[PDB]
UniProtKB/Swiss-Prot annotation:
Name of the protein: Lysozyme C
Residue ranges occupied by any C-type lysozyme domain in the UniProt entry: 1-129
Reaction catalyzed: Hydrolysis of (1->4)-beta-linkages between N-acetylmuramic acid and N-acetyl-D-glucosamine residues in a peptidoglycan and between N-acetyl-D-glucosamine residues in chitodextrins
UniProt: substrate binding residues: D101
Presence of the UniProt keyword Signal in the record: yes
Amino acid sequence: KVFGRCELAAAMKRHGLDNYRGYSLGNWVCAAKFESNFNTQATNRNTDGSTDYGILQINSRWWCNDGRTPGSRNLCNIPCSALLSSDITASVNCAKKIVSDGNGMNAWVAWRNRCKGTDVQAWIRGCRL
Ligand SMILES: [Cl-]
Ligand SMILES: [Cl-]
Ligand SMILES: [Cl-]
Ligand SMILES: [Cl-]
Ligand code: NA
Ligand SMILES: [O]
Ligand SMILES: [O]
Ligand SMILES: [O]
Ligand SMILES: [V+3]
Ligand SMILES: [V+3]
Ligand SMILES: [V+3]
């Protein structure tokens, strides 16, 4: 599913991401925009052999099981395929564990490089949430 900007903001807020670990909703929408262009089916192979999955490009190196990433963990206890669902619950629940892991949203390199420090409220501006 390719979410609209406001549609994803509303869903992320309903799922508890708004101010989760202090990160305002715009941070999460911005990260999703640059990680997946709001496409739940986005997948990208990393140079290390891991794969990023879903709207928040969660990596099989640590967070999910895809059966093809040697030496990896599955800290969210889920099939990476669950991160591609039109329903963002699995991606949100796993993102909550990732963002609580110590480096906050810096875990998302696109967030650090393209959202961090910017006017992220612009991502939820005008939205009926
Ligand atoms: Cl915001
Ligand atoms: Cl990535
Ligand atoms: Cl694996
Ligand atoms: Cl933080
Ligand atoms: Na894994
Ligand atoms: O919502
Ligand atoms: O990644
Ligand atoms: O959901
Ligand atoms: V990657
Ligand atoms: V649901
Ligand atoms: V709502």
